[PDB]
Amino acid sequence: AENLNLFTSTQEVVKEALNKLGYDEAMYELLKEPLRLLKVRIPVKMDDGTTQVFTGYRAQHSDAVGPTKGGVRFHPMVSEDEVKALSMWMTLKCGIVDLPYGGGKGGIICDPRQMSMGELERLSRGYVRAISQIVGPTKDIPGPDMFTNAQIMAWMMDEYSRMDEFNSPGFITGKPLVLGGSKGRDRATAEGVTIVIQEAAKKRNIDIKGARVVIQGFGNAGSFLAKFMSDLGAKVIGISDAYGALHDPNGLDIDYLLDRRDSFGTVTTLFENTITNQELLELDCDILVPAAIENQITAENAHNIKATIVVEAANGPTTSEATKILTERGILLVPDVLASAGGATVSYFEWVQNNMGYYWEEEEVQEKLYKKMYDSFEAVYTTATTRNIDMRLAAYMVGVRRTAEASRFRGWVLE
Amino acid sequence: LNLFTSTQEVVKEALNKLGYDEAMYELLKEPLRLLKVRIPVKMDDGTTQVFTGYRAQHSDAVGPTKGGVRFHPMVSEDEVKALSMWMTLKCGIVDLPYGGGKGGIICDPRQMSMGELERLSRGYVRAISQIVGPTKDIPGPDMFTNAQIMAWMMDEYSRMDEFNSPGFITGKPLVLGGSKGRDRATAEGVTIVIQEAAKKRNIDIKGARVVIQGFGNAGSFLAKFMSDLGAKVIGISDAYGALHDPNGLDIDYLLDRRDSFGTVTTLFENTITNQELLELDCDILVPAAIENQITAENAHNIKATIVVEAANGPTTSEATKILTERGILLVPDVLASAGGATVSYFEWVQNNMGYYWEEEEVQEKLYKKMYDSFEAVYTTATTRNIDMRLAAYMVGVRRTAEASRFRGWV
Amino acid sequence: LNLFTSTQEVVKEALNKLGYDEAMYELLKEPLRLLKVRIPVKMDDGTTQVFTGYRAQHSDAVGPTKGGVRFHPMVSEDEVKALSMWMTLKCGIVDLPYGGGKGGIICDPRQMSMGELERLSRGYVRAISQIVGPTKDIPGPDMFTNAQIMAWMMDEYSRMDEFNSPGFITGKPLVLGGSKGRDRATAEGVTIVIQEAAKKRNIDIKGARVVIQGFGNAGSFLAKFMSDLGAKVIGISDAYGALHDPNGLDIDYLLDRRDSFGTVTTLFENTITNQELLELDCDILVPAAIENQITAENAHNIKATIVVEAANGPTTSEATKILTERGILLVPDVLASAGGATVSYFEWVQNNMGYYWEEEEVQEKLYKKMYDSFEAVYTTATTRNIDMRLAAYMVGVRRTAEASRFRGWV
Ligand SMILES: NC(=O)c1ccc[n+]([C@@H]2O[C@H](COP(=O)([O-])OP(=O)(O)OC[C@H]3O[C@@H](n4cnc5c(N)ncnc54)[C@H](O)[C@@H]3O)[C@@H](O)[C@H]2O)c1
Ligand SMILES: NC(=O)c1ccc[n+]([C@@H]2O[C@H](COP(=O)([O-])OP(=O)(O)OC[C@H]3O[C@@H](n4cnc5c(N)ncnc54)[C@H](O)[C@@H]3O)[C@@H](O)[C@H]2O)c1
Ligand SMILES: NC(=O)c1ccc[n+]([C@@H]2O[C@H](COP(=O)([O-])OP(=O)(O)OC[C@H]3O[C@@H](n4cnc5c(N)ncnc54)[C@H](O)[C@@H]3O)[C@@H](O)[C@H]2O)c1
C-alpha cells in the first residue's frame, strides 16, 4: 500500500524540512501537532423542529508568528486528521508568502447540501458560539473553504459581533464587500494559481498562448482558473467534475460551461460524451492542475501523467510517493502550499483592511498579490534547485522557517 | 551633576520660553506614574534573587508612552524618571503620537546567564503588565537589552493576554513583527541632519573639510559616509589620539587597519591630540566619541561652521551658548539621533495594521521625518533667536503642553 | 557548554592518541601557575577603584610562556585558563620554544580615560612582575589592548628592572622594539597555508577556483590576495548574501563598493544565498565568516578540494569527520591562524638579540614557519589516518608532553 493519510504524510515532510534546516528534534516535536485542537459538539434546531448535534473542529497549529489563519469546511468526511493537516499547510502557505500568520483550520461533520438556508445559519452561529473563546481578530481568523462561502462568513461575523457587542470584521475573512470584505477575494486563489503557471511556464519555456492545460475540478478554483487560462490564450483541453470530465483537443468553450455550471461547480452531468476523472489526469497536455480534492495523483497513476508541469490548486492532490515519482520523471511540480497561497494572501489583505478600517481597490490588491506570488515562486524554485530537492520539500523548508525561528526566539524551544 | 534635576531645568526653561505658566511646569516636572517593583527570580543555582525594577511614564497627554528598558548595576529611580522625560522630548522633536517612557532593572546582566535573563525579563513584564501594553506604554531595547530580551518580554505579555500583542514592545526580531531598516536608522538620521545642516550654510559636501571624533560604530560609519560623498575627512580620532591630513585622510585605509574595538591611532607614530583635533579648521565638526568634549575651555577655539552631535552630550551648556553666538550651526544630539525613536514608532504602526513595509519604504518614511524635524527646530531656533538645543527642547515639549491644556489637566 | 572544560577535553584526547598516561593529562589539564591579583587604580575623579586581574601560565616545560592580555568586562578565570592552554597548542603547532600563557583584567575600557587605562596597565605589571619577564612569561596585545598598552606595560616593567626589557612583552611600537612584518601577520599566514594546501593537491593556484565566505577584515584581504596570485575568486559573501561569477568576481571593484561594515551584497541583488555559495564547485573554499557554516547538513554537499578555516569554529565536529571521510584537505583554524603568534615570537627573538629584521626577512621566516607547521600537521594526520584538526591538536601538545617527561615532571 501507500501512505494516504494527509496528516502523517505532512508530518514526514515537515520533519525532513526541519532537519535539513538544522533544527533539533524538539522543534519537530513542537510543530508536528497543533498547539491547540478544540473538538466541540454543536446542537442545532432543525426545520422539522427536532435537534441535531454536530461535531466541529478548530485546530490552531502554531501561534508563534502571529494569529492563526484558515478556513472552515462543511463536509461529511471532515476528520480530525484532515483538519490538522489542513491547519499545518496554512502555516506553510503563510510562511512561503510571508504573512504574520500561523495556520488554523476548522471543519464540521455535516452534509450542507441536505440542509436548508436556516439550518446552515444556525449551524454556523452554533460553531462560532462553540469556539468563540479561542478565536477572534487577534487570535484565530477563520474563512471560507469548500462548500462554505460569503453568506456563511457573514452569518459567522454577525454572531461573533453580537457576542463582542461591537462589529468585528477582522474575526473572519471572505466577507461580502458590504460587510468589510476585500476586492479580489473571489478570484484570489485561481489568480495566484495563474501566476505560478506563468512562472513555471517560463522556466520550462512553454508559451501560454497555445499551451494545452487540463484542470481537475470546476469549482471556485477550477472554473476561475479555466477562464484565466482561456483568455490568456491557453487551450483548456479538459475540465473535470465530481461526476465526470470533458475533453476537447481544440480547447473547451469555457464561457459556455461557466454559463451552465451550478454553485457547487458541477457541469458535467449536462453532457453525454463524458470521460472519467482517472482518464482526465492522464491525457497528454503541458499543464495539469488538480483543483478538486486530495490524493488524486497516487502511485497507481503518477507514471501515467503526461504533463510537463503540474500545479496544485487543490490542497493535497498528490501523495508522497507520487511527488517522488513525478520529480524523478522530470516533471515541474508546483506544490499546493505555494500554488494556492493566493487565497491566503488576499484573505490577509482583507484582515489588514479591517485592522485599519480603510479599504483597497482591485488594482492595489492585484499589485500586492502579484508581488507576493512572484517573489515567493522564485524563493521555492531557487531553493529546490539549489538544494537538489523536490519542490514540495523545498516549499516546506521555505514555509516552516519563520515559525521555527519564532518558536526559538520566544523560548518555546531553547537552544 | 544629578541628571533628573538637570532634566527638570530643561523642561522648565522650554515651557517658560513657550509661554506656559507655572502650573504646566508642575505637571511636567515629574512623571505622572512611576512604578517600582520587586521581581523574584529563580537563579541557575536554585537560590531566589530579588531584583528592583522601575517603569516611568512621564506624560501620556499626546498618546501612549514610549521608551526602552535597561539592565545596569547603576540604574536608579532618578535615572529612569529623567530619561522618560527625555523620551517625551525626543518623540515630540520628531512629532510622534507618543509621550515619554522608560524602564530599568538593577542588575548586572553580564554576570547572569541566558536562563536568568529570560526569567528576569518575564518577571519584569509580569510585574508591570497592569500599566503597559500596545495602547498604554511601549518599551524597547536599551543598555544591555537587545532583540532577544524584547522577544522574551513580548512572549510573556502575549501569554498573559492570551493573544499575540507584537505592538507591546519594539525592537523585536523580524519574525516577531520587528521593522525592516531598524539597525541603521539612528546613523542614517545623522546623515540626513548632516546634509540638511550643510545646505543651511550652503556648504557642498564634496570637497568640504570635515573632522569626526571617534572611530567606533558611529565614527567608522560617519567617516566612510562623508568620504564617499567626496568630502575631505581631514581628521579622525581615538581614545588614544588623532590623525590629521590637510588633504583628507585615506578613510578606507584607516577603516581597513582598525581593530574590533574602535582603535586605530595606536598603529601610527605621527599623531595629534584629541584636543587639537576638535580645534582644527574645517567645515563640519562631528563629535562622535563621548560627552563634555566641547566645553567653556575650547568653545571659542573650535573653528567649524557646522557641529552635528553624534555622541550624546558632547557639548556643555556654557559651550553651547558660546557656539551659537559665534554663528556656528549646532545640531543637538536629541535631534541628530532621533532616527532610532522614529523607526521604533514605524515598528509600532506596522504592528497596529498587521502589515509590514519594505526597507526602501521605511527609509523614505524615515528621511522625511528627519528632514521635517530638522526644519522645525531650525525654524524655531532662527525665528526666536535661540540656540538649536533650547529650540529643540521647545519643539520637544510643546505638543505635551498643548495636549495637557486641551484635555483639561491645566 | 563551557570553554575551559571543553579545552580540557581537547588536551585529553590529544594526549590519549599520542599514547601518554593519565598522569600527563593530570599535569596539563590545569595551568601550573595561576595568579589572581587585585589592582587599585586612581580614577580621574579622585576615587580609587580596585580591579581584578589574572595571569595564567599553562606549562613552561618548553620555555617561557606566551600569551596576550585582554581588558574586557567578561574576562573570567576559566577563560584565561582555557586560552592559555590554547596558546600552548598554538605554540606547539608552529614549533615555538614557548608554552602557553594568558592574562585578563575585568574592566570596561569603554568607560575609562586614557590615564585610567595607563595607570591600570602599570598597576597590572606591578601586580604580576614577580612571575613574568623576558625569560619567564611574555604578554602581548589582545581584546581592547594594543601597542600603546604594550608600550605602557613595557615601560612599567623596564622601570621595575632598572633597565630596558623590550622582550618582556610583544606587540610593541616599532620605536620600542616591535617587529616589522606584523600588521597582517595572521592573514598572510592563511595565504601561506592556502598555497601549501594547494600544492599538496597538485592544484595550480594561478588558475584555481576560490570561494571565500565573509567580506570583512579577513574576507576582503584574502580575496584581493587570491585575485592577485591569478586565482579566480568565483564567490564572496557578507551577512546579507553572496555573489557568484564562474570566471572571477573582480575583487578590486568590490573592495570599492564596501560600506564599512564589510557589506557589498546589497548593491547587486542579483545574488545567491550563503547556503549555495558554500556548495559551489571549486578548488579552495575559505570560510572567513562567523561559525558553524559547515555542518552535518552542509558537509556532504561542499564541493571544494580544500577547505581552509579562516574563522574560528566554522566547521563542526560532525562536519569535520565528513570532509575527512570524503578526502577533502581541511586546514583547521588553529593552524591557519598561527602567523600572529609566529611574528610575536620573531619580535621576542629580535629583542633577545637587540637586532631587528626587515619586512622581507620577517616574511621569509614566516613562510617557512607556516609551511613547516602545515607539513607537520599533514604528516601526523596522514600517518595516523585521522582528521587534520585532531592532528593539529596533537602536534600542539606533543612538545610539552615530551618536555614534561624529559625534565622529570611525570
Ligand atoms: N479556501 C478557499 O477559499 C479555496 C479556494 C480555492 C481552492 N481551494 C482549495 O482547492 C480545492 C477546491 O476548492 P474550491 O473552492 O474550488 O471548491 P468548490 O467546492 O468550490 O468546488 C469543488 C470542485 O471539485 C469537484 N469535485 C469534487 N470531488 C471531485 C472528484 N472526486 N473528482 C473531481 N472533481 C471533484 C466539484 O464537483 C467542484 O467541481 C480544495 O482542496 C480547497 O481547499 C480553497
Ligand atoms: N549612530 C550614532 O550616531 C550614535 C547612536 C547612538 C549613540 N551614539 C553616541 O556616539 C558615541 C559613540 O558611540 P559608538 O557606538 O560609536 O561607540 P564605540 O564604543 O563603538 O566607539 C567609541 C569611539 O570613541 C572613542 N573614544 C572613547 N573615549 C574617547 C575620548 N575620551 N576621546 C576621544 N575618543 C574617544 C573610542 O576609542 C572609539 O573610537 C557615544 O557617546 C554614544 O552615546 C551615536
Ligand atoms: N569584539 C569581540 O568580542 C570580537 C569577537 C570575535 C572576533 N573579534 C575580532 O573581529 C575580527 C573579525 O575579522 P573578520 O574578517 O571576521 O571581519 P568582520 O567581522 O569585520 O566582517 C566579517 C564578515 O562576515 C560577514 N558575515 C556575517 N555573518 C555572515 C553570515 N552568516 N554569512 C556570511 N557572511 C557573514 C560580515 O558581514 C562581514 O562581511 C578579528 O579581529 C577578531 O579577532 C572580536
Strands (E), A293-375: 309-311, 332-334
Quick check: A19 and C295 CB within 8 A? no
Q: Give the 3-state secondary structure of residue A132.
A: helix
Please name which of B118, B123, B179, B128 lies closest in space to residue B150, comparing C-alpha atoms: B118
Instruction: Confirm whether residue A265 is marked as ligand binding.
Output: yes
Which residue of B266, B275, B292, B358 to mutate against C (max C Cβ within 10 Å)? Answer: B266
Cβ pair A59, A106 in contact under 8 A: yes
The per-residue b/e assignment along C170-195, b for 16 or more CB within 10 angstroms, e otherwise, is bbbbeebbbbbbbebbbbbbbbbbbb
- What is the structure's resolution, reported in angstroms to one decimal? 2.6
> Would you call B163 exposed, middle or buried from its count of C-beta atoms within 10 A (0-12, 13-18, 19+)?
middle
| Euclidean distance between CA atoms C195 and C192, whole angstroms | 5
How many Cβ pairs within 8 Å bridge chains A and C? 13
Which residue of C244, C276, C303 to mutate against A (max A Cβ within 10 Å)? Answer: C276
CA B326 from chain center: how many Å? 27
Please name which of C146, C200, C178, C210 lies closest in space to residue C375, comparing C-alpha atoms: C200
Interface check for A382 against chain C (CB to CB < 8 A): the answer is yes
Which residue of C270, C297, C318 to mutate against A (max A Cβ within 10 Å)? Answer: C297
Q: What is the DSSP string of C361-375?
A: HHHHHHHHHHHHHHH
Q: In chain C, which residues have their Cβ closer than 8 Å to the Cβ of B224?
A: 259-260
Residue nearest to atom 40 of ligand 3 (CA): B260
Quick check: C273 and A386 CB within 8 A? yes
Interface check for B110 against chain C (CB to CB < 8 A): the answer is yes
Quick check: B165 and A65 CB within 8 A? no
| Euclidean distance between CA atoms B14 and B18, whole angstroms | 6
Rg (CA), chain B: 22
Q: Give me ligand 3 centre to Cα C290, in Å.
A: 6
Give A97 to chain B, closest Cα distance, Å. Answer: 13
- Spatial CB neighbours of C394, under 8 Å, sequence gap ≥ 6: C14, C17, C18, C380
- Dihedral sign computed on CA atoms, order C340, C341, C345, C348: positive
Q: Give me ligand 3 centre to Cα C179, in Å.
A: 26
Q: Maximum CA pair distance of chain C?
A: 65
The verdict on the CB of residue C264 being under 6 Å from ligand 3 is no
Interface check for B261 against chain A (CB to CB < 8 A): the answer is no
Instruction: Confirm whether residue A73 is marked as ligand binding.
Output: yes
Q: What is the DSSP string of B360-408?
A: HHHHHHHHHHHHHHHHHHHHHHHHTT--HHHHHHHHHHHHHHHHHHHTT
Please name which of B133, B32, B121, B128 lies closest in space to residue B70, comparing C-alpha atoms: B121
| Euclidean distance between CA atoms C174 and C152, whole angstroms | 14
CB-facing half-sphere around the CA of C91: CA atoms within 13 A:
30
Q: Is B152 left (phi over 0), alpha (psi -120 to 50) or beta?
A: alpha
- Spatial CB neighbours of C162, under 8 Å, sequence gap ≥ 6: none
Quick check: C273 and A22 CB within 8 A? no
The verdict on the CB of residue C214 being under 6 Å from ligand 3 is yes
Give B83 to chain A, closest Cα distance, Å. Answer: 28
Interface check for B155 against chain A (CB to CB < 8 A): the answer is yes
Interface check for B163 against chain C (CB to CB < 8 A): the answer is no
Residue nearest to atom 9 of ligand 3 (CA): B260
CB-facing half-sphere around the CA of B58: CA atoms within 13 A:
35
The residue from A105, A175, A183, A227 that is catalytic is: A105
Instruction: Confirm whether residue A307 is marked as ligand binding.
Output: no
Instruction: Confirm whether residue C81 is marked as ligand binding.
Output: no
> Would you call B371 exposed, middle or buried from its count of C-beta atoms within 10 A (0-12, 13-18, 19+)?
middle
| Euclidean distance between CA atoms B96 and B90, whole angstroms | 9
C-alpha cell at A282: 492522464
The total number of residues shown for chain B amounts to 410
Interface check for B159 against chain A (CB to CB < 8 A): the answer is no
Across the interface, of C74, C146, C261, the residue whose CB is closest to B259 is: C146
C-alpha cell at C408: 622529570
Quick check: C275 and A382 CB within 8 A? no
Q: What is the DSSP string of C227-285?
A: HHTT-EEEEEEETTEEEE-TT---HHHHTTS--SSS--GGGT---B-HHHHHHS-EEEE
| Euclidean distance between CA atoms B205 and B199, whole angstroms | 9
Q: Maximum CA pair distance of chain A?
A: 63
Cβ pair B217, B210 in contact under 8 A: no
- Please, which experimental method was used? X-ray
| Euclidean distance between CA atoms B164 and B184, whole angstroms | 27
| Euclidean distance between CA atoms C15 and A259, whole angstroms | 84
C-alpha cell at A43: 446542537
| Euclidean distance between CA atoms C259 and C347, whole angstroms | 34
What are the C-alpha distances in Å from B207 to residues A306, B247, B329, C338? 68, 10, 19, 43
What are the C-alpha distances in Å from C402 to residues C67, C325, C408? 21, 30, 10
Choose the residue to mutate in C90, C290, C312 for probing ligand 3, maximizing ligand atoms within 8 Å of C-beta: C290
Quick check: A382 and C273 CB within 8 A? yes
List pocket residues of ligand 1, CB cut-off 6 Å.
Answer: A 71, 144-147, 189, 216-222, 240-242, 265-266, 277, 291-293, 313-315, 340, 343
Interface check for C74 against chain B (CB to CB < 8 A): the answer is yes
Q: Which atom of ligand 1 is nearest to the CA of A315?
A: 41
Give C50 to chain B, closest Cα distance, Å. Answer: 17
Measured from the Cβ of residue A116, the count of other Cβ atoms closer than 10 Å reads 10
C-alpha cell at A27: 522543534
- Spatial CB neighbours of A39, under 8 Å, sequence gap ≥ 6: A55, A56, A57, A80
Interface check for C6 against chain A (CB to CB < 8 A): the answer is no
Q: Give me ligand 1 centre to Cα C97, in Å.
A: 78
Instruction: Confirm whether residue C168 is marked as ligand binding.
Output: no
Measured from the Cβ of residue B74, the count of other Cβ atoms closer than 10 Å reads 10
Dihedral (Cα; C71, C73, C78, C83), 10-degree rounding:
-40
Helix (H) / strand (E) element for A247: namely strand A245-247
Quick check: A22 and C275 CB within 8 A? no
| Euclidean distance between CA atoms C289 and A392, whole angstroms | 31
Instruction: Confirm whether residue B312 is marked as ligand binding.
Output: yes
φ, ψ for residue C309, nearest 5 deg: -75, 115
Q: Which residue has the cell 538649536?
A: B388
Q: Give me ligand 1 centre to Cα C227, in Å.
A: 58
Please name which of C261, C231, C269 lies closest in space to residue C249, comparing C-alpha atoms: C231
What are chain A's partners, defined as 3 or more CB pairs within 8 angstroms? B, C
Q: In chain B, which residues have their Cβ closer than 8 Å to the Cβ of C109?
A: 239, 261
**Closest chain A residue to C295, measured at CA:** A22
| Euclidean distance between CA atoms A250 and A256, whole angstroms | 15
| Euclidean distance between CA atoms C66 and C168, whole angstroms | 10
Measured from the Cβ of residue B170, the count of other Cβ atoms closer than 10 Å reads 29
Q: In chain C, which residues have their Cβ closer than 8 Å to the Cβ of B221?
A: 260-261
| Euclidean distance between CA atoms C90 and C288, whole angstroms | 19
Cβ pair C99, C61 in contact under 8 A: yes
Rg (CA), chain A: 21
Q: What is the DSSP string of C129-176?
A: GGG-BTTTEE----TT--HHHHHHHHHHHHHHHTS--GGG-SS--GGG
* Sheet containing strand B242-244, strands side by side: B242-244, B232-237, B209-213, B281-287, B303-308, B329-331
- Spatial CB neighbours of B328, under 8 Å, sequence gap ≥ 6: B302, B304, B305, B306, B307
> Would you call C17 exposed, middle or buried from its count of C-beta atoms within 10 A (0-12, 13-18, 19+)?
middle
**Closest chain A residue to C293, measured at CA:** A22
- Dihedral sign computed on CA atoms, order B43, B46, B52, B58: positive
φ, ψ for residue A258, nearest 5 deg: -60, -35
| Euclidean distance between CA atoms A369 and A372, whole angstroms | 5
Residue nearest to atom 44 of ligand 3 (CA): B260
Cβ pair B317, B336 in contact under 8 A: no
Q: What is the DSSP string of C17-40?
A: HHT--HHHHHHHSS-SEEEEEEEE
Give A16 to chain B, closest Cα distance, Å. Answer: 22
| Euclidean distance between CA atoms C253 and C240, whole angstroms | 18
| Euclidean distance between CA atoms C410 and C402, whole angstroms | 10
C-alpha cell at A414: 531553547
Interface check for B106 against chain C (CB to CB < 8 A): the answer is no
Beta-strand pair C209-213/A36-45: unpaired
φ, ψ for residue A333, nearest 5 deg: -85, 125
Please name which of A63, A64, A59 lies closest in space to residue A81, comparing C-alpha atoms: A59
What are the C-alpha distances in Å from B24 to residues B59, B401, B407, C45, C350? 12, 7, 13, 38, 73
Interface check for C406 against chain B (CB to CB < 8 A): the answer is no
Q: Give the 3-state secondary structure of residue A25.
A: helix
Cβ pair A129, A162 in contact under 8 A: no
The total number of residues shown for chain C amounts to 410
Q: Maximum CA pair distance of chain B?
A: 65
| Euclidean distance between CA atoms C73 and B97, whole angstroms | 39
Beta-strand pair A332-334/A309-311: parallel
Q: Is C199 a catalytic residue?
A: no
Type of residue numbered C319: A
**Closest chain B residue to A412, measured at CA:** B155
C201-204: Cβ within 8 A, 24+ apart? C201/C283, C201/C305, C201/C306, C201/C329, C203/C283, C203/C284, C203/C305, C203/C306
Q: Give the 3-state secondary structure of residue B29.
A: coil
Beta-strand pair C65-66/C137-138: parallel
Residues C125, C131, C134: CA angle, nearest 5 degrees: 80
The total number of residues shown for chain A amounts to 415
Q: What is the DSSP string of B274-328?
A: HHHHHTSEEEEEEE-S-SS-B-TTTTTT-EEEEEE--SSS-B-HHHHHHHHTTT-
Q: Give me ligand 3 centre to Cα C289, in Å.
A: 6
CA B159 from chain center: how many Å? 31
Q: In chain A, which residues have their Cβ closer than 8 Å to the Cβ of B147?
A: 409
